[PDB]
Design a protein around this ligand. Structure first.
Ligand code: SAM
Ligand code: SAM
Ligand code: SAM
Ligand code: SAM
Lengths: 233, 241, 233, 233
């Protein structure tokens, strides 16, 4: 019934711009409904944040045991949802899991190979490891003009890291989405309103943004990476 | 364009996956419905669907949108065998290029059916005259590389419009384009026989003689993952200008 | 309040002969003459419900100038009686053509399940001052067959039509009914006529029970057509 | 296998309400008598004779639908001019008939006759075997309101007088019907203006007298036409 495929998409659109991060969770949840069965028993979410993915998880899947992880419990049955709080690279994973899901969080990790060792041991055989992260061009306009940002993995780094850690890969995709704001100030407004973020430096930042001024506006790039994976066989 | 808190966007995607080859049409009607949830209001009084067919898109339309009056169109009258009679659903059976469109429509929707139209610019004129001001035109269709494997090996297919032929025809018909995209999917089957079985199982479709050389001809499309079959869906969310 | 039309009541009765096989056509001729009285000779858009073989259809085109003629019936197999625009299907489940000058129907509305709300679509599809003119059948139609076999249809009467037409927003310019009894030579001739017009001991009993419908001229068979000429107000 | 052309006996009754142009009443009686002629008579007729043609409203309907080879018109006066159109002017009860007729036709004229039984003797001898005698006249309820409010009016035959007289003269009756029509004018003056437009001190009481005929829809004027399709033996 299943058939391997390669795909490539492109188009021009309009976005509410304040919605960008929740729609990434919506796209990841579509991939979960595709591959994973409706019913699962034990699930572990890393970096749950405000809970945009968790509410999509519970309303689309039937899970009995749910473990939520983040540095803070800002998500506001109940004995079925338990709280593991702290840096996930410091904590011991819940065991015998059907699925580990993460959304927009793995880019903050310092030692991903070691963390994927914890993913392997905690998961059952053919247990699901599904996550969304970001590639090297995510918010690269801010990286060039301010010298700040994360060093991201690309698709080949993830591929050779999951295979070397003993994971079979079912889905591995990436996307580059350029938003075009009217002026460089609206770019900063979007970053504050979505929570990502001298007077000399401010307008000097607005001067150099002309290097990113296209016919439609000043560009801001999001580079989400999507992956669906299974353990061992 | 001059509207605030909406931002223009350009995107590109690529990846490798495992699909259920029989679910392709459901995948496209699901993708189009996901676009309808983004751009369109949750309630619509009058909606018109061209080429309802089995009803894959119709199922997704009624569960996500409160519709007061739903009008369904298709070529065959026995399309009404795949549906149960409801008071708020009317029918317009026949070739849609020969039928008067229902009046005062909030949205005209159609999934993987406009590629069978003979006169597309004349149909877009009817869409414009049937929609309310700022009425919705949202459709799925197919691009030029659609099933190019079957076009080359059998010499049969369709004439497909590309994005900027659509972009040009919609703008001059009076439509503003809010969303316009396309994707290319190559499915890798294990053998050319699975390609033919897939084409008949999903309802797209000589013997042993020509059936054997067609298998050897398909060797030109064999990747390391299997034998390719290309799908080229086109999506478009438009509004009456 | 028109200064040339005048309110009218009439009643007629008499004895005659009839070619028993042309009843359906004769019913159409009576409706066609009522159309000639009230209606303009030119109408751009006309919608005919239940055209059938086209008895009333050809009488419409012969005496009126129509630009858009839409013909409806249940079965597409009646287009083989013509050659217009075609609207095949159950009229109660069909999207009406809009901005109509007249909606015509001959001996077909007695088959409808929900007449009050089909009139609502007759109201919306018609222009201001649009015409609604039809012939149907009354409660005593084929009552000899319903009394003997228990089979038949529930027919509205005039007062039901006068009530539902004004409740839906229609004026009434003509509302009449006729009862006609044809006296066949024998009950066998009644069955022969019923199958020619397209409508062992159970058979002999039927011939016996029909003697209760014996008159001086023959055996009875009642037709009860209703004629109406309405207009949207 | 075989065609179907079986005449059957029939008794009918009609009733309803309507609107109509008051100036159009004789033209409609002519239109109704022409409908009966089309239902009983062949399209081809060699010799036709009309009694009381008058304005010619029935004559235009006759030649419109039937193929006549010789047409003789009769009336007290004379209102195409082909060579096969003859005129017989004068009191028809003092004139010898044209012989070997296929049909004798008359519209709204036989009510003025002084000796109908004698005139039926002439109709018999002039008609061929199975030759048609068709006419429209009026019954005793015709203009009954003007009859009692002025004490003036003609003496009319009823249906039984005609049925007995035709059978006595040697005629067979294939159709015999009567109709009562009550027109409702806004006021008795419009009744008089109708009586003066259609060729038919003490005034205020004649209006006061007319209140005896006041319905809810207006003041009544009654027409009582009689139709009969006969053929000679
Ligand atoms: C961009 S938010 C994601 C919010 C959204 N609900 C989702 O899941 O996609 C990423 C979250 O990961 C959390 N996070 C980052 N590093 C972490 C770590 N080392 N251990 C646990 N949580 C971490 C942060 O607190 C942040 O809330
Ligand atoms: C691929 S099917 C789409 C079925 C289903 N709605 C879906 O997309 O999953 C395309 C449909 O378009 C209809 N169609 C083709 N030509 C048409 C025409 N000229 N007018 C109306 N419908 C047409 C066909 O009947 C066929 O069922
Ligand atoms: C007695 S025939 C009339 C035929 C004749 N040509 C005429 O119109 O006077 C009635 C017709 O109505 C059609 N009919 C019955 N129910 C219908 C419905 N619900 N919707 C549309 N047509 C219907 C039937 O197919 C049938 O041909
Ligand atoms: C009231 S008109 C009806 C005319 C109408 N156009 C029609 O024929 O249907 C009857 C006609 O009969 C004529 N008529 C009356 N008495 C007649 C008589 N004795 N001989 C010949 N014509 C007579 C009158 O002159 C009158 O024109």
């Amino acid at each position: 019934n299943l058939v391997a495929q390669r795909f490539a998409k492109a188009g021009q659109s309009y976005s509410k711009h304040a919605i960008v991060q929740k729609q990434i969770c919506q796209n990841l949840t579509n991939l979960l409904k595709q591959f994973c069965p409706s019913a699962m028993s034990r699930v572990f979410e890393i970096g749950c944040g405000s809970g945009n993915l968790t509410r999509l998880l519970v309303e689309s899947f039937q899970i009995e045991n749910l473990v939520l992880n983040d540095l803070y419990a800002e998500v506001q049955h109940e004995e079925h949802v338990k709280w593991l709080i702290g840096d996930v690279e410091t904590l011991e994973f819940p065991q015998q899991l059907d699925m580990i899901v993460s959304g927009s969080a793995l880019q903050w990790m310092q030692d991903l190979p070691r963390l994927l060792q914890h993913c392997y041991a905690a998961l059952n055989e053919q247990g699901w490891l599904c996550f969304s992260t970001f590639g090297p061009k995510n918010l690269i306009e801010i990286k060039e003009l301010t010298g700040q940002g994360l060093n991201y993995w690309n698709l080949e780094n993830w591929n050779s890291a999951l295979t070397q850690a003993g994971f079979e890969i079912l889905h591995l995709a990436q996307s580059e989405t350029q938003l075009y704001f009217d002026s460089p100030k609206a770019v900063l407004q979007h970053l504050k309103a979505t929570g990502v973020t001298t007077k000399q430096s401010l307008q000097q930042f607005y001067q150099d943004y002309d290097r990113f001024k296209h016919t439609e506006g000043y560009s801001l790039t999001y580079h989400p990476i999507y992956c669906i994976a299974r353990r061992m066989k």
